[PDB]
Amino acid sequence: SMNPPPPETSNPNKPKRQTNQLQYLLRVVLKTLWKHQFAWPFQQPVDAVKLNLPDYYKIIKTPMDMGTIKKRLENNYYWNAQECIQDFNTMFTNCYIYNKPGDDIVLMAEALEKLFLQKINELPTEE
Numbered sequence: 001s002m003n004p005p006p007p008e009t010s011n012p013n014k015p016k017r018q019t020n021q022l023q024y025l026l027r028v029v030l031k032t033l034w035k036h037q038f039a040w041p042f043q044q045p046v047d048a049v050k051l052n053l054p055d056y057y058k059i060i061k062t063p064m065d066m067g068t069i070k071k072r073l074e075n076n077y078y079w080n081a082q083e084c085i086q087d088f089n090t091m092f093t094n095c096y097i098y099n100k101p102g103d104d105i106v107l108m109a110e111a112l113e114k115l116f117l118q119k120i121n122e123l124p125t126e127e
């Protein structure tokens, strides 16, 4: 059994910025989700070997997780907030695509996603 390489978190030739919106995504959005009781399955890439999910990376072709997003934010990987918001949405969508309604992991994702939506509703206007 084999995991793919993780998503990219470093690329010196990708242009990047540290906008007030990106700072909010780290300080408010990531921090809020990371500390939640249901964060743990989302704090690193899905390990299809350890979890015995040999079909996971056949079904999910754009993997994403908050460990990756945390590294991207800490490393100032992004150009804009939309890039980062897309990563959170990819993470949630992947979970809904792979799993069944009512599974524990789906309930966990839905709780995180409610908080995510509440926090990005107050994304600040760009400085």
Ligand SMILES: Cc1noc(C)c1-c1cc(O)cc([C@H](O)C2CC2)c1
Pocket (backbone or CB within 6 Å): 040, 041, 042, 046, 047, 051, 053, 094, 095, 098, 099, 104, 105, 108
């Ligand atoms: C994310 C994700 N997407 O699909 C699956 C399956 C997971 C997943 C990842 C984990 O690191 C651990 C678990 C456990 O089953 C948790 C729910 C009790 C699930």
